[PDB]
Amino acid sequence: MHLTPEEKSAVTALWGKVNVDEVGGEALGRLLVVYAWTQRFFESFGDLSTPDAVMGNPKVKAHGKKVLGAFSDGLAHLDNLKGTFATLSELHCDKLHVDPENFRLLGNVLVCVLAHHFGKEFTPPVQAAYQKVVAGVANALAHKYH
Amino acid sequence: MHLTPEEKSAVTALWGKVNVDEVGGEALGRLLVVYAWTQRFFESFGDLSTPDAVMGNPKVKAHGKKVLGAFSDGLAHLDNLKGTFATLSELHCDKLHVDPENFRLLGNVLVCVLAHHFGKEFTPPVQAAYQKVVAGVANALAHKYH
Amino acid sequence: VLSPADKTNVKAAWGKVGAHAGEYGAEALERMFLSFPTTKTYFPHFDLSHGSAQVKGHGKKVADALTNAVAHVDDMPNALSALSDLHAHKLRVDPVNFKLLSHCLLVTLAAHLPAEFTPAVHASLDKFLASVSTVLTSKYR
Amino acid sequence: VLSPADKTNVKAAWGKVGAHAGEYGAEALERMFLSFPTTKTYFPHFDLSHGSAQVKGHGKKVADALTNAVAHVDDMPNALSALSDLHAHKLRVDPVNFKLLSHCLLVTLAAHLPAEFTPAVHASLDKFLASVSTVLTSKYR
Numbered sequence A, B: 001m002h003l004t005p006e007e008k009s010a011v012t013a014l015w016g017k018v019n020v021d022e023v024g025g026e027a028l029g030r031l032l033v034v035y036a037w038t039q040r041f042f043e044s045f046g047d048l049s050t051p052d053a054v055m056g057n058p059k060v061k062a063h064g065k066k067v068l069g070a071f072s073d074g075l076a077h078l079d080n081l082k083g084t085f086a087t088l089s090e091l092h093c094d095k096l097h098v099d100p101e102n103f104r105l106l107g108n109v110l111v112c113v114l115a116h117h118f119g120k121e122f123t124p125p126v127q128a129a130y131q132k133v134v135a136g137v138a139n140a141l142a143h144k145y146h
Numbered sequence C, D: 001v002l003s004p005a006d007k008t009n010v011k012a013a014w015g016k017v018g019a020h021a022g023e024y025g026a027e028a029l030e031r032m033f034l035s036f037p038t039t040k041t042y043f044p045h046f047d048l049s050h051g052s053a054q055v056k057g058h059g060k061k062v063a064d065a066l067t068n069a070v071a072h073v074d075d076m077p078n079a080l081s082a083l084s085d086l087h088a089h090k091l092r093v094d095p096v097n098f099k100l101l102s103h104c105l106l107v108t109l110a111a112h113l114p115a116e117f118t119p120a121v122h123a124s125l126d127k128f129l130a131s132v133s134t135v136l137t138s139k140y141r
């Protein structure tokens, strides 16, 4: 992860201020609303016909928290994303059959959610470092696909 | 660039039968015919208005030969694509201002050209190995962009 | 948009394909699964081994739909309507994948049609598959 | 394709942008050049330093073309015909880059319009920018 010290530092300080429960739920929710076809993996979560239904769905919120929690743990392993997410990569491929393009879409939604939450503080340099992290995570999650 | 020994053998074997001069001219010409916007880089080459004008243009043929000659040289250094192409990467970014997406388009056109020339011999497994190689070269040429 | 010359090129090339369509569809699929393994996530219920009957059967279906689009080249959005609904509402394949299959179909045609696959025809076919992909993806959201 | 609700969401969000369009346009550009450095290849004649007047002026132009698109949402291909010709025949920017600018404009809006950037409006704006990109690359070949 060709991350610069000033870049690593930017990611870390911002993240220390994130409410993972809220952001996770908001990220996964926006993904399902903005890119409707991603709902194909979540038929069993219930009603998702409208944005209000998606955003309020308790299983959506809870799954978002779990996803972002694993993302969070990965931010402590920025020198070894591949090794950290290897097991998860295999599961996403072998059991869940999730097209990795989904990981890129969530990345970008995540970035929009961070900007929405932090406004001013989410300056261009800070976005740039986060784009590198989100692509890094997506790439590690896809690494074990075969 | 994870290439298995059997993939590397398949790539090298086929490449030994390629007339780089001719294939170079075809690939570059086809890029300019199929993705007409890539002509933005070659306004000094003269007439590029019809397929015959592009394909028979001596400057396109000569540039194609130069491009593919560098690419072959790369096939002799599959374990160090990044180092091999470092100065060319710099040049394409700082002096020529070429959007790296162009290297990916050329890679896919080259794959069609190999398919066209070799027919049956360009089996699904052989194509898969070439797809990894063209992506590897594209990634190496992009690595010095900033 | 397809030009008159593009339409001519596509009918000519596809007419040479003729009664091999199905076979070429299956090859395009195999090529795709091997070159771009992430595409396999959409076919977990298939046997994907070489010579698989499910792969053969699905190849024919894909090839028949392309034949139909060629037969209705001036009315593609309507000729492919049902398929557009299916992809948008049920299958929900990420749009990037269409570009991958299209590439593999082009490689397949190149490998089997040495004389027809001229630069001009290559260009027209690429445009044709891109328009088909656009239609199939037009109702996604 | 844009639904009525989409058009209503887009007009209202852009309405709140108001006199800040120019500034946001410039901000979206700066975010793009930093996040996605390959985009700088299309602007070798620009001083790309923070606060440059070329980025500022270009941000205004981009922003105003979007305003015109919002105002002409039902007739975009005609309202943007000249820009569509410009990108296809002169500038010849690779289509992939349009998604990068679109994402950066969304991030800009999200950062500046917290109450207005609801999940449904985020969806509408994403579809609108996608449509605008489609129109701008529709004459490429």
Ligand code: HEM
Pocket: A038, A041, A042, A066, A067, A068, A070, A071, A088, A096, A098, A102, A103, A106, A137, A141
């Ligand atoms: C930031 C990237 C992502 C990370 C870090 C992540 C992480 C996780 C984790 C930790 C689990 C729990 C697995 C377990 O209990 O063993 C999971 C499950 C799952 N993930 Fe991902 N995920 C990501 C993105 C996605 C996306 C984009 C999709 C599809 C849109 C997806 C689909 C699923 C599905 C379908 C499950 C199984 C849910 C169930 O138990 O019913 N994931 N993910």
Ligand code: HEM
Pocket: B038, B041, B042, B044, B066, B067, B068, B070, B071, B088, B091, B092, B096, B098, B102, B103, B106, B137, B141
């Ligand atoms: C396989 C990928 C490629 C390789 C290995 C390659 C290699 C080369 C080489 C060896 C040169 C000559 C360098 C010099 O003059 O010092 C060159 C020049 C150039 N390349 Fe690339 N190239 C590749 C792809 C492309 C693509 C796809 C484009 C644009 C679509 C492009 C645009 C150019 C241009 C405009 C020049 C300068 C031509 C001139 O002399 O006026 N290259 N390249």
Ligand code: HEM
Pocket: C039, C042, C043, C058, C061, C062, C065, C066, C083, C086, C091, C093, C097, C098, C099, C101, C102, C132, C133, C136
């Ligand atoms: C040239 C573009 C494509 C065309 C013309 C096409 C056409 C078709 C047709 C005719 C069917 C059969 C529907 C039926 O039974 O009535 C089908 C189903 C299907 N397609 Fe598409 N398709 C295309 C691209 C793709 C791609 C890119 C993917 C994802 C990689 C995909 C995934 C599927 C899947 C998973 C099925 C269901 C297979 C089954 O369960 O039997 N298709 N398509």
Ligand code: HEM
Pocket: D039, D042, D043, D058, D061, D062, D065, D066, D083, D086, D087, D091, D093, D097, D098, D099, D101, D102, D132, D133, D136
């Ligand atoms: C929403 C998408 C976009 C819109 C609405 C847009 C609109 C415009 C406008 C209004 C102009 C000025 C034309 C004039 O001076 O009259 C322009 C020029 C230009 N645009 Fe696009 N643009 C978009 C995306 C892009 C992207 C993605 C790129 C490449 C990264 C790009 C590169 C350029 C360049 C290089 C110029 C010429 C700038 C100059 O030399 O001053 N544009 N565009």
